[PDB]
Amino acid sequence: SEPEHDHRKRMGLKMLLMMGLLLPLTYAMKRHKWSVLKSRKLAYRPPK
Amino acid sequence: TDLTDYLNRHYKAPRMVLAAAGGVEHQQLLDLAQKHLSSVSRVYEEDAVPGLTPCRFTGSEIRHRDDALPLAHVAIAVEGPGWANPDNV
Structure with missing residues (x-):
């Protein structure tokens, strides 16, 4: 059934290995x- | 008291330039500086010399959004070298 194993x-x-190499690069x-x-x-300075 | 302390600390004698430009000569100006401007401070009053520290330039962005104003002013700058660096020219 699996000659592809x-x-x-x-x-x-x-x-x-490729995903573990290229994922922290995009994360950073x-x-x-x-x-x-x-x-x-952010700050709000209304005229009061 | 704060102004008195500021004038006692920062208006010292060796930090003053008496500059004259125009129809004057140096000998009369030097005699006038000897007569009137002698003995300004000549003292530090605590033996604690004040100096200057190099202030770091950091990149940031301040946005004061106020949409009722008719026009918008934006100033973008990087760090200049200083007074003593010739590449300013």
Whole structure:
């Protein structure tokens, strides 16, 4: 039923290593491009 | 008291330039500075010399949104070198 087993698991660990390499890169990029926003403090100065 | 302390600390003698430009000569101005401007402070009063620390430039952004104004003013700048650096020219 499965003559595909060894090559499937080969692509499996290749995918796992590639995903574990390329996911913190995009995570750090997203954290940078949103840490420009999350440091924003707002103030309201009405004329009273 | 705050103004008295400020004038005692920061209006000292070695931080003053007496500058004259125009129809004057240096000898009469020097005699007038000797007569009138002598003995300004000549003292530190605590043996604590005040100085200057290098102030860091940081990148930031301030937005004062007020939409009832007719026009918008935006100033964008980077860090300049200083007075003593020739590349200012």
